[PDB]
Amino acid sequence: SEEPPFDIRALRADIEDMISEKLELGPSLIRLAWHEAASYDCFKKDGSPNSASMRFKPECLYAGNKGLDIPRKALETLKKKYPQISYADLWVLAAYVAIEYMGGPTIPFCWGRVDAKDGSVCGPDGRLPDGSKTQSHVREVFRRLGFNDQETVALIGAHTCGECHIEFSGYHGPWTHNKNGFDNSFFTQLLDEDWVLNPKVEQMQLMDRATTKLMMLPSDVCLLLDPSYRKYVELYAKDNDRFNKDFANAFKKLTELGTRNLHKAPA
Ligand code: HEM
Ligand SMILES: [Ca+2]
Numbered sequence: 001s002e003e004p005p006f007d008i009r010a011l012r013a014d015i016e017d018m019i020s021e022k023l024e025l026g027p028s029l030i031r032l033a034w035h036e037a038a039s040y041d042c043f044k045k046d047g048s049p050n051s052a053s054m055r056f057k058p059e060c061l062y063a064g065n066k067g068l069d070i071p072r073k074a075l076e077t078l079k080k081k082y083p084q085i086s087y088a089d090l091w092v093l094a095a096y097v098a099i100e101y102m103g104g105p106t107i108p109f110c111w112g113r114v115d116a117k118d119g120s121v122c123g124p125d126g127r128l129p130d131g132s133k134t135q136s137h138v139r140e141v142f143r144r145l146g147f148n149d150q151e152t153v154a155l156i157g158a159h160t161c162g163e164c165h166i167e168f169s170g171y172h173g174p175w176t177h178n179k180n181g182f183d184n185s186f187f188t189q190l191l192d193e194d195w196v197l198n199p200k201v202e203q204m205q206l207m208d209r210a211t212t213k214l215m216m217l218p219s220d221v222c223l224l225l226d227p228s229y230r231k232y233v234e235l236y237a238k239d240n241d242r243f244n245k246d247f248a249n250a251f252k253k254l255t256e257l258g259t260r261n262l263h264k265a266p267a
């Protein structure tokens, strides 16, 4: 529709380059964008999602955002090179490129997000979801964000890529045997393995009986235990195209929560 004031083409290319020079950045950029949107409360209408408010204290110090300085710092180099882009746009755009680069769907980008100017707009701590908890908590968090059960399950399928780091969350390991590819293999893994207790990680997590090299969180396996969430796990495990499409729509929605006057980018 409308040309952004920054060179989007060149920028897309710089972000693919940066990811290619450091592949484990792909998943952290997705998590960065998700956590900047995850402060929203659709009932209270607060929390400054999608405003790059995680640049500021105290949100940058919340336990759940630990390690997200890495992708923020990496993107600083690009903000410098393309000054017309807001950080908030940049953070969203880099997640979309990451998803695509790793084999995921191409999500239509909208631009024009305004950056928070100070940390007084940041939402409270305790809005990010807790991996040690299960379906009650999960549904409560995602209701509060504006998502239904179908959207919830689709979004959590992003765990198909990346991994847990002891230093950041206290959990350990990848969910899938290809942490650098974005497909429906998180649901597939969830359903096809026998998940057994990992007796050597201090924060409770499961491991696959077959190899013991994969992991799931309590919040992940709660998607099997809940009868509504399990319908959708099954839907995505048996239909990768459907997963691509629903993930695309839900993530776009996630990254457009609490925004206004966006413009559709070209491609
Ligand atoms: C129930 C909701 C969620 C919980 C409890 C949760 C929990 C976690 C935890 C504990 C980590 C590990 C962080 C680390 O140690 O580095 C993580 C990583 C990640 N999560 Fe989530 N997550 C949730 C939902 C989501 C959603 C909705 C998205 C995306 C749409 C997402 C995408 C990711 C990605 C990409 C990583 C990888 C980060 C990396 O490799 O550096 N997660 N998640
Ligand atoms: Ca925020």
Ligand SMILES: [K+]
Pocket (backbone or CB within 6 Å): 159, 160, 161, 176, 177, 178, 179, 180, 181, 182, 183, 185, 186
């Ligand atoms: K994967």
